[PDB]
DNA sequence: AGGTAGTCACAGCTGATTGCGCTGAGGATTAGACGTGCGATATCTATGCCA
């Protein structure tokens, strides 16, 4: 199941990247949660929105 | 027999008493998230325009 569902659909809708840890959009975080640019530079894009692990 | 020290009966000084105030411990007491509603906005394709 993990192998099948590892980034298979490849969604590119802004709403889908929210509350989705597999994508973890920078703008779709919380006040207390924050990205780490050291281990996440770029993994994908959606309407000019970068993806971080 | 004589006078002032010991003894007892009362006076000033001061501490305890009785109203009342104050602290210290002790037990009582709407702001980012999470969504949607509305509104501005990208977005895909029919199809007939005349060269």
Please state the φ and ψ torsions of residue A3, each to the nearest 5 degrees. Answer: -65, -40
Closest residue to B32 (CA to C1') is A31
Angstrom distance (rounded) from CA A53 to CA A25: 8
Q: How many CB atoms lie within 10 A of CB A47?
A: 8
Please choose, from the candidates A10, A5, A39, A37, the residue with its C-alpha nearest in 3D space to the C-alpha of residue A23.
A10
A28: helix, coil or strand?
coil
What is the number of H-type helices and E-type strands within chain A? 1, 2
- Chain B nucleotides close to protein (CB under 7 A) are 32-35
d(CA A17, C1' B1) / Å: 138
Place of tokens 């929105």: A49
DSSP string, A2-26: HHHHSS-S----TTTTTT-TTT-BS
Can you say whether the dihedral through the CA atoms of A20, A34, A3, A1 is positive or negative? negative
């Amino acid at each position: 199941f993990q192998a099948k569902h590892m980034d298979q659909p490849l969604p590119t809708a802004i709403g889908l990247y929210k509350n989705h840890p597999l994508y973890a959009l920078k703008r779709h975080l919380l006040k207390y949660e924050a990205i780490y640019p050291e281990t996440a530079a770029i993994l994908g894009y959606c309407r000019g929105e970068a993806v971080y692990s």
